[PDB]
Ligand binder design. Sequence first.
Ligand SMILES: Nc1ncnc2c1ncn2[C@@H]1O[C@H](COP(=O)(O)OP(=O)(O)NP(=O)(O)O)[C@@H](O)[C@H]1O
Ligand SMILES: Nc1ncnc2c1ncn2[C@@H]1O[C@H](COP(=O)(O)OP(=O)(O)NP(=O)(O)O)[C@@H](O)[C@H]1O
Ligand SMILES: Nc1ncnc2c1ncn2[C@@H]1O[C@H](COP(=O)(O)OP(=O)(O)NP(=O)(O)O)[C@@H](O)[C@H]1O
Ligand SMILES: [Mg+2]
Ligand SMILES: [Mg+2]
Ligand SMILES: [Mg+2]
Lengths: 761, 312
Amino acid sequence: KKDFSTAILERKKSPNRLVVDEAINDDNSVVSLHPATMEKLQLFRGDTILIKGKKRKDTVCIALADETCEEPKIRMNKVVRSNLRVRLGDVISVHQCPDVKYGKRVHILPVDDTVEGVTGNLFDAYLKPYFLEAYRPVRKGDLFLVRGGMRSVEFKVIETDPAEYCVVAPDTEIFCEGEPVKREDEERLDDVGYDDVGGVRKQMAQIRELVELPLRHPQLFKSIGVKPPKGILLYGPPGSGKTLIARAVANETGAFFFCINGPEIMSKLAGESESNLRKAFEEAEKNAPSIIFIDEIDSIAPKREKTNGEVERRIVSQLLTLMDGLKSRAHVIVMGATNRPNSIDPALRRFGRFDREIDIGVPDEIGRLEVLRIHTKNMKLAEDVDLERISKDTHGYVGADLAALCTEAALQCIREKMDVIDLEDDSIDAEILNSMAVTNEHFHTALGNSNPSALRETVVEVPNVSWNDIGGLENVKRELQETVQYPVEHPEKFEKFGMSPSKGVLFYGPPGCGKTLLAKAIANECQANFISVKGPELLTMWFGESEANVREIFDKARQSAPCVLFFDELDSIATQRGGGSGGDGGGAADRVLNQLLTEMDGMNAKKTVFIIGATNRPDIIDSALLRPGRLDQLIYIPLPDEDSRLNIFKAALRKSPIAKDVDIGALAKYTQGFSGADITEICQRACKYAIRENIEKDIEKEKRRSENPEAMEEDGVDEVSEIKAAHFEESMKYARRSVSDADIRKYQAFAQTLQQSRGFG
Amino acid sequence: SNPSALRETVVEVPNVSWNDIGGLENVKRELQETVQYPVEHPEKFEKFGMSPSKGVLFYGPPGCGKTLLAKAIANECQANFISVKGPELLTMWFGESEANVREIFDKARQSAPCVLFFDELDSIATQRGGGSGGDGGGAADRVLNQLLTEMDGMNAKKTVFIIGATNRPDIIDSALLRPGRLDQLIYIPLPDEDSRLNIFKAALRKSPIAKDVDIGALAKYTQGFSGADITEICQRACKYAIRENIEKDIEKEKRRSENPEAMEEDGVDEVSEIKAAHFEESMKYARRSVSDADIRKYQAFAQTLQQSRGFG
Ligand SMILES: Nc1ncnc2c1ncn2[C@@H]1O[C@H](COP(=O)(O)OP(=O)(O)NP(=O)(O)O)[C@@H](O)[C@H]1O
Ligand SMILES: Nc1ncnc2c1ncn2[C@@H]1O[C@H](COP(=O)(O)OP(=O)(O)NP(=O)(O)O)[C@@H](O)[C@H]1O
Ligand SMILES: Nc1ncnc2c1ncn2[C@@H]1O[C@H](COP(=O)(O)OP(=O)(O)NP(=O)(O)O)[C@@H](O)[C@H]1O
Ligand SMILES: [Mg+2]
Ligand SMILES: [Mg+2]
Ligand SMILES: [Mg+2]
């Protein structure tokens, strides 16, 4: 089996599907099909055909024959590619045009920017010389290019007869009647689509199967005897993808789309907001199938505790009544968008309303890369821009932030060219304008000068850490496999033996021994999402979103199953219940303790969700967290031993320029009782010393050359500046253990007597 | 899919029976008198001109089966069971406020007969601080005083029994032990040699245990272990067996794939029963959750718990 969640997105290869390719002819009403492809299509040489494009756009052209066109090719020209909205490499479908429909009229009008420089009737110069007796097929809404000399005027197919498409026979009596098709109309063409949304595939698949399927193929649901949900609610960080995704789905499904912007509704006088809502719903019902996208729904339907006026609760109630009135099932779907899912009134998040919710969260590396590719598809990038590096460096960047980053890169490119650009002149040199290109350094500078927005939001992603990055801890990994991986990859195994596992683990040990890394590594092994939460972050949550922060992170973990919810730095929240119970500063630790235990109680029934903790202070750890049904498994992470420290050094320096004479194993003997953090700080000090050394070396070399320029560039060239043993010796000189010999036997004692904390002392 | 009404109080008869609980014969015998008789036979007490008490407190080492006894006695009497934990009560005040404890008690009244169990009294029933103060503990003080107030009005409802459970009898507020409240005191001891065999059997009553595993043998070696430790031993053993049979199946499939001509021999996946080796390995890492110094103290409290309403 496989994960069939992302199955609707898959394109089903068919004999009628041909890949896009360049044509041998620039004819706009004629393409060229390979003879074999035509035979599969039952077509013949020079036969009109309908090409199915993207965004519900299609054109009509006569297919020729040529053996150079490989089987998975169609050989269309640039104009057809633009009309279909398909770039090279897309997979269009081909259908026949048996009804050639020799048209009596083919209304043709020009575009203003393609007419600049025409001093004669366009009908007698462009249209008639190429259409009369040519029998060129024409598809309404497609821009065919024409030439009548030096100027090239492109006309849109305004109004054919038949209306859809026809063939331009000699009987087509028509001329150019005015210029009403100015180029600015392109703002509503090629606007949005599936290809314009990147970084979301699971959410996009969910939206498509909840919106497009009920509206295009309701027969499936009717036969299965299930009524599909009518309420969808997109939510996520501001600027992520919501309004784009809604419009993309609406345009791709080809259903009547009505946008109800919250500010627009609330900016009108009382009695017009409700009137507009009623009109929108009525029009959607009349023109079914339909979609009603309510952007910024939080403004028109905020939490009832926050809304003050009566003409706001009235609008909320009107919206609720209208949604309740949609149970007629007139192929109408109401989709929402709100960055504040909790700010929404609870009534909306109920059956018969917005009951199905999709979280358009922060994208991962591949998503950011795809977003950047989408946004830079039009910019004049140079041949040395590496978007992979930028995507790796852009952590916490939503799509809007990436678009702003591209814009800032372009601006920085302009600033570099400001020296050769004079602002006083009302016009800029054409050659200078066309020679501006965005380089990688511009992007790096823009990224340095740009800041992320969704850097505080919880991130649900598979960590990149593997077992290799962690040195030693073989037994800990061996037991973690049993505790986590087996009940996830093989859940039925436990049911076979009639015994359920435990969904809780606690890591206790000296600081810097690799407790945070183990959680990430085990998540990576099981390919399960990882949610990182720190005690300091939890403590500020109560002074803020309050009760709905811990509940929210746990709900997110539930929605993201399988998951590994890690609570680092339990030394603060899990502080043992004070004997003199009191205070509000610790009344937040008591909250993050009791409310957290309450959620732990309800989490054992979810399955495939494991709650892992980490504490450097097992003495103060609340004994309640150790209860069965909670973090009861206790795993001790010891200080690395002689063998483990070699692995730790190697991992810390797995990508370092270390010299050939450095004995990694030698340091292990001298560094005993040092945590992994100290072992990494040793390497950091060594790297800093090497940087100092090679900085001084390069400075001395350049100063030697400048102290008599006649001195030529000798064979001496900048070297690796590898980390010599001297640097490691100097680092070990200042290196100091972060765990004392008196603070290790105590950890051993707690390893012995930790779970006994639920009783007396 | 995720549930929605998973935080709401559930008023249902638990599925736990006396069989799931090992040992504790005397505790069950006295619980019958304390609970079942005044419910099934209410007129009996009126016949003798003496009313019973609607309060019980379970105090003992953790993992000895205090939560299970309440559910079992509810199941025996076919009475509804309402489970409330101290951590849940503490967050109620920062929320619905006064109308959470009142609401659970009203629900218990409406659901009579009922067994209102307050697990984890170690937090709400924290002894009234000598230096009374603070708002973090001002929630424990609330869930204490407001709870006692409801207990006072609950003795007239009849067929409603309030049971508590505390692993820290030292800090238990002396007010909860007053007559008209949780005044009956029942001590749940650590299981003895005979009880541990029953606990193992119950934990493994639906397990594939092999024919050579001596359940009684483990009982001798595991002394001072709570029932939770006895169940974690079985959990470790099951995990080891899962590892063993996972590796066995992987090796078998890899053997077949390392030359597909090798046919499917008579060897087929077996029960993968829990062999004695798994139990030995589990006992290797098994560690008591109750120390020998933290059992004599429970005995001392069994002796001198109800004397907490006076001085120290
Ligand atoms: N996944 C994406 N792929 C491509 N462009 C994107 C993507 N996400 C965002 N953008 C770009 O960034 C813009 C901002 O996103 P938008 O769709 O307005 O977000 P929003 O969630 O509706 N914002 P708000 O209502 O202010 O919280 C879009 O209009 C695109 O130009
Ligand atoms: N076993 C290890 N192998 C390799 N690097 C390690 C190891 N342990 C610690 N480190 C390094 O030291 C850093 C700190 O350790 P970390 O994994 O954050 O432990 P922690 O328990 O979260 N520490 P603290 O929050 O300070 O108590 C890691 O991110 C690594 O760079
Ligand atoms: N007498 C017993 N017989 C069988 N299983 C038992 C017994 N005592 C404890 N257990 C097992 O151990 C688990 C924990 O015991 P439980 O009945 O929750 O005691 P508790 O007093 O609520 N513990 P705690 O809240 O940790 O102080 C039970 O759910 C059973 O799985
Ligand atoms: Mg929006
Ligand atoms: Mg930690
Ligand atoms: Mg209890």
